[PDB]
Amino acid sequence: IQPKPGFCVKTNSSEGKVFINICHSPSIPPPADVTEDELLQMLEEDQAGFRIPMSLGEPHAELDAKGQGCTAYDVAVNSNFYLRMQNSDFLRELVVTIAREGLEDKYGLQLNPEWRMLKYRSFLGSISQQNI
Amino acid sequence: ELDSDDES
């Protein structure tokens, strides 16, 4: 399953720049299904839980604008679910948070909780690969 | 304006 690009989130981490590429693949499948009502409320409980399946790709190194090196992670969700997300700030903020949170655990350790989302760039890497 | 990583 080769992920198709979505958006890109710049953040930092004590040792320097970290970019998370949020992609999507039709084959994941979603946490089907729920609307804004239920899940704005079930974060307060439900878990664990918890749904939102996402693949968290290995790190890969890439160059930034100034030519200094930095780290990039690719996170994939369901395409159908991704489209839900894209016209909803809250859900977007959620996915980013789960993405940073689940990454911190898998790879260790610190990540900036606070972030920025790029505007004109959908992905930093290539992008790879993954786990067909 | 913008971030240092796109394409005051």
Author numbering:
A (entry chain B): 48 to 179
B (entry chain D): 6 to 12, 96
Quoted passage from the original study:
Pih1 is the multipoint scaffold of the R2TP complex, coupling the Rvb1-Rvb2 hetero-dodecamer, the Hsp90 chaperone machinery (via Tah1 in yeast or Spagh/RPAP3 in metazoa), and the TTT (Tel2-Tti1-Tti2) complex implicated in activation and stabilization of PIKKs (Hurov et al., 2010; Kakihara and Houry, 2012). The biological roles ascribed to the R2TP complex are directly associated with its ability to interact with the Hsp90 chaperone system and function as an Hsp90 cochaperone (Boulon et al., 2010; Izumi et al., 2012; Takai et al., 2010). Here we present crystal structures of Hsp90-Tah1-Pih1, Hsp90-Spagh/RPAP3, and Pih1-Tel2 complexes that together define key structural links within the R2TP core in yeast and in animals and reveal how R2TP connects the Hsp90 chaperone system to the TTT complex involved in PIKK activation.
Interaction with Tel2 involves the N-terminal segment of Pih1 (Horejsí et al., 2010), which contains a conserved region of unknown structure (henceforth, PIH domain). We determined the crystal structure of the mouse PIH domain1–200 with single-wavelength anomalous dispersion phasing of Tel2-peptide cocrystals (see below) grown with SeMet protein (see Experimental Procedures) and used this to phase the mPih47–179 apo and SELDpSDDEF peptide-bound structures, which were refined to 2.1 and 3.3 Å, respectively. We next obtained crystals of a complex of the PIH domain and the Ser 488-Ser 492-bis-phosphorylated Tel2 peptide. The PIH domain consists of a twisted five-stranded β sheet with one face traversed by a helix-turn-helix segment connecting strands 4 and 5, and the other face traversed by a coil segment extending from the end of β strand 5. The interaction of the PIH domain and the Tel2 phosphopeptide is highly unusual when compared with other known phosphopeptide binding domains. The phosphoserine phosphate group and the side chain carboxyls of the flanking aspartic acid residues on the Tel2 peptide cooperate in an interconnecting network of polar interactions with lysine residues 57 and 64 in the PIH domain. An additional interaction with the PIH domain main chain is provided by the aspartic acid side chain +2 relative to the phosphoserine. An additional source of specificity may be contributed by the hydrophobic interaction of Tel2-Phe 496, positioned +4 relative to the phosphoserine. The PIH domain itself and its mode of binding to the Tel2 phosphopeptide are distinct from previously reported phosphoserine/phosphothreonine-binding domains such as BRCT or FHA domains (Ali et al., 2009; Kilkenny et al., 2008; Qu et al., 2013).
